[PDB]
Design a protein around this ligand. Structure first.
Ligand SMILES: N[C@H]1C(C(=O)O)=CC=C[C@@H]1O
Ligand SMILES: N[C@H]1C(C(=O)O)=CC=C[C@@H]1O
Lengths: 278, 279
């Protein structure tokens, strides 16, 4: 029998942010059963905490309802906040398939409130499928070049001219299903405050509330396209239209040709706790 | 304020099959607005909330999809009945809903509720009258039977497919289907005592549902009306196969078209998990 906790990631109160189900003592579960359990929970991801293999504190496997991911932001944020309760550490090192991700935990009186990760440095290139994507989204143009970033998963970015235009999107999910192993992140905003919406049939979700692995790349994206400065922290608010407002903090340090750090951070809170029969 | 819940996999005898429902106990202190939010947090096709009775039943149940409330629904109530059945020795349970009181018979094995049967509301029906639009949304040219919509609280449209291969091949346009409000699109194929179903409902906040319990009753009526089975003949409807959530619903509609005396839907259910929430 496995205990799990539900964490609302990128939120300071239950019912906001993006839920993840974090399953403890999962070494006995085969990955095919992990996948099935994630299908059962039907949250954007469920995670599994395994004994470490390469010097971290744990090894974390990450599953959408339909696939395994080698890295994801909300799921690992939630896992780090839940795991934080086990110990007194303020530094946590979580192994994933993309490598070991360092976390700084924000604690008060030993109690975990928030966490900050150092993400893998993404690479990027032009999508090369603009007409198709914009048709799918129901729009004419992107405000900035449409590029796709890889840090484990992949994330494509499409800019909108206003927050109203971003909220007005009604994408064709079936057309979006032609975009494999990627999530589509639409953004709008100004200066240090940006809004996002994410759509990914490839990762099993019509619309996700907080796509944590997209936040760092967006910050890169905005700085490469002159809208913010490298090293300038931004707030990205996602999930508003679906009732799941999620605040992601991101900061990309260095320069386009040589990034040195991609930090994403947020609050998380416990929604519930229980146990599954297998 | 804290609430205990159980996750029941409805219309399955083993965990990880069937259709999950999250059942929250002692839920009277949650306003409907918060119940809707909790149902979104769980993100299951439905969550239910167990309230004290007002009309002589055992409990009053409110039912929520990720995006709306429903006056009745079959997998959520089945799972609710199995869950509440653990707390009682009784053979029958009466669950008040907005559609009236639904009677259940509980089946035990050893000291354990393993299944239940309900008597569903008798539906009304008519044609949908929008065949061309719906068929284009589904990605096909027609139905094997007249496209009709049944109402037993929620609404269910039925589109017949000529084979199981044809049914598994559907890749509907979710957005185009969102233009059909307040209903679920149930696509079926099969023969005799054995049918496959797939359900799609942007209106009820699900791309594809695993086991649409309130559709099982109407489908047996629909098949009897259209001469593919006889009234009163039990059928097995297997739903959710293509999404990896095989679910087995048993349905029997007794009487005749002009006068149905019982629409019975039953199935197995199993506990997958349980827990507590912080509000
Ligand atoms: N939660 C998202 C995720 C993330 O980084 O949090 C990556 C890809 C898809 C998921 O829905
Ligand atoms: N499970 C379904 C339901 C039912 O009767 O189980 C009714 C309407 C939509 C839900 O996804």
């Amino acid at each position: 029998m496995h205990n799990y906790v539900i964490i609302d990631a990128f939120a300071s109160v239950p019912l906001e942010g993006n839920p993840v189900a974090v399953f403890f003592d999962a070494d006995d579960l085969p990955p095919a059963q992990m996948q099935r359990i994630a299908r059962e929970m039907n949250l954007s991801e469920s995670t599994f905490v395994l004994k470490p293999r390469n010097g971290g504190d744990a090894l974390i496997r990450i599953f959408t309802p339909v696939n395994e991911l080698p890295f994801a932001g909300h799921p690992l944020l939630g896992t780090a906040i839940a795991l934080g309760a086990h110990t007194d550490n303020h530094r946590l090192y979580l192994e994933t398939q993309m490598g070991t991700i360092a976390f700084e935990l924000e604690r008060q009186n030993g109690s975990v409130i928030a966490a900050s990760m150092d993400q893998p440095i993404p690479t990027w290139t032009a999508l090369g499928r603009d007409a198709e994507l914009l048709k799918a989204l129901g729009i004419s143009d992107s405000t900035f070049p449409i590029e796709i970033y890889h840090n484990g998963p992949r994330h494509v970015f499409v800019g909108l001219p206003s927050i109203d235009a971003l909220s007005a999107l009604h994408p064709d999910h079936r057309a979006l299903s032609n975009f494999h192993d990627m999530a589509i992140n639409c953004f709008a905003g100004a200066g240090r405050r940006w809004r996002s919406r994410m759509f990914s049939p490839a990762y099993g979700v019509v619309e996700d509330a907080a796509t944590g692995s997209a936040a760092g790349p967006l910050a890169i994206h905005l700085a490469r396209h002159g809208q913010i400065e490298f090293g300038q922290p931004v707030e990205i608010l996602q999930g508003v239209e679906i009732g799941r407002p999620s605040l992601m903090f991101a900061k990309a340090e260095g320069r386009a040709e040589q990034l040195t750090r991609v930090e994403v951070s947020g609050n998380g809170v416990t929604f519930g706790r229980g146990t599954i029969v297998l």
